[model samples]
Target: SMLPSYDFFIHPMNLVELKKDIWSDSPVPAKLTYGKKKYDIDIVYRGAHIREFEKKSYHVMFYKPKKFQGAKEFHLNSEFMDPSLIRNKLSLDFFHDIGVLSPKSQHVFIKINGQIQGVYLQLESVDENFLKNRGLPSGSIYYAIDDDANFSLMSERDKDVKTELFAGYEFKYSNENSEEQLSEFVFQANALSREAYEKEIGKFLHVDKYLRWLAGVIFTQNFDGFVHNYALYHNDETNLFEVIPWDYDATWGRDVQGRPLNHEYIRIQGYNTLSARLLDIPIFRKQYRSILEEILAEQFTVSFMMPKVESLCESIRPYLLQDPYMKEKLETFDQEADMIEEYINKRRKYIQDHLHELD
Candidate 1:
């Protein structure tokens, strides 16, 4: 099963290093016990500089286990202020269904040091193992860590040293000259003419895949996703980068804290500078528009998404009630599900009416 079933155990028991600095990335000895089996693991705080201080989210590394599907690592996404606790899970599911190279995610309950830390999204880690499992080429991997890698015109113009390109991205894995290969590639895309960029850019990134992911992010209204919350990879065979979505807790008309998003915050003009250029091209823009229309007519419709929401609501209900967060408990998980359905309906309506205005 993709999820750790809560029908049996209300929460997975987490034994952690409570004494360590909450913000530190240093791995601490830990263990997770679920379904009557104990698995050894390591715990560490993970986020950008700001969220690191928040101490709410965590990343866990599991020693390859005989059970639990033999996963090597998993991310315990606290989802910060989202009450529904399904935003990340739902967003990932939606992306995957819509043909985005998104992470696999499932709802999980966390008990830190024997105290209930509430519901967290258990996301699949996007590492070499992830690529291997999906039969994707495992080559140079980059995680967008800052604004520098936002694919802007200035990103190439302001480039000083090649090593600094890796500044904005964490090089997870690479072959020889993988740095020069990626940094030079992006700079050229930024510097090249539209025709040159289109023809040559395919060598750097899978335009179709990137655009689909871009559209998915825009569809979800995930403001946090554009500049960061994404993983890029270099393919040795195709010599192109593949984009993947990450950290989607702050999405779907919410600012991570579950606040209402402006109905029309993102237009066809999405967050990535590179994508904006892609949309400027007539054929590329038409392709993106076609994908958006198809998704809305099929997957993004309220009628289609509500059943999935209902099923998630049923599976996560008992754990939602078990959570220690009083506001979430009082607000009611069923109500959250209802609100989510309403949200999908409202979001679909907003996009349906305003999509023509994208030009």
Candidate 2:
């Protein structure tokens, strides 16, 4: 689904030039034209301190109060952190194909004032428009901005949040007359008894779906998002919470710390607080194993995923050869693509071998 034909543009040079300031600073203004239509947008140097690097990432907001193919905003991930360049988009597609509420992604060419910037992965934003498009309730949305938002049920700064759960969360939606509802819900949900929590995690949270998402994370080893790099939304009609995955460049057994995950030892416990607590219960453990097995049987294989990796990675071939920044930093796209294939082979064997290690 790499839309190689489409263009990503930022004008006046200010947006690209001001990236230095945008790294440790704030978003800047820009105008973007994709073809026949134009979008008034803000461009910000995105990603963790890596934005300080030569190959950069961007966060764009289409500020015109409309939707582009059903989104108010989008992320053009330079994937400076990823040499393979196929990990994030393929990971997202894997999640979507396996029944997870993840962002839609496509590869596109990027530019500034008709000058080539590079190739980027176009990630659809998970916002009000995303919910509305799916006919799901657009109630409230929050991003787990920091690692401390691990649903540890503890405030990071030790703030006295009596009414609001104001620890590591960045609330992104209507909190006007709806204050404290989410905090109260998270608190109560975490406080449920073991049996109740295991049997009824679906009441406040979507257990099966959450497990599916977790399975995706585990399969890809996207530990960056296992407990963080996620979004939470409440369904107004169902009043249940759903998990959305994000920022997946750190997958395939590598994390933000750049540490390689133990190919043979992925514990369901001792990692994320919520997952640890839930997996402690035997019933939840059994359920989790079942889901992982199902996913492995159905989608977590090179046969099911490699064609996508080949297609998306190859689409950037012509662009990569010409990308001034990319060529200097990385070699042929085929070399990086081989790395992804290697990761997938090892990951598949590891999961298949230890599917029951947690039990």
The candidate that achieves the highest lDDT relative to the unseen native structure: 2
State the lDDT of candidate 2 residue by residue for 36-149, as single tens digits: 777778778777776766667777887874557788788888776677777788878888888988888887777776777777788887878878888887688888887557
Q: What is the lDDT of residue 114 in candidate 2?
A: 71
lDDT digits (tens) for residues 211-273 of candidate 1: 788878877788878888888878777888878888787776577556766654666567666
Cα displacement (Å) at residue 168, model 2? 1.3
* Model 2: ten consecutive residues of lowest lDDT: 158-167
The TM-score values for the models, in the order shown, are: 0.86, 0.87
Candidate 2 vs. true structure, TM-score: 0.87
Off by over 4 Å in 1: 1-17, 48-55, 64-70, 112-115, 153-163, 262-264, 326-332, 357-359
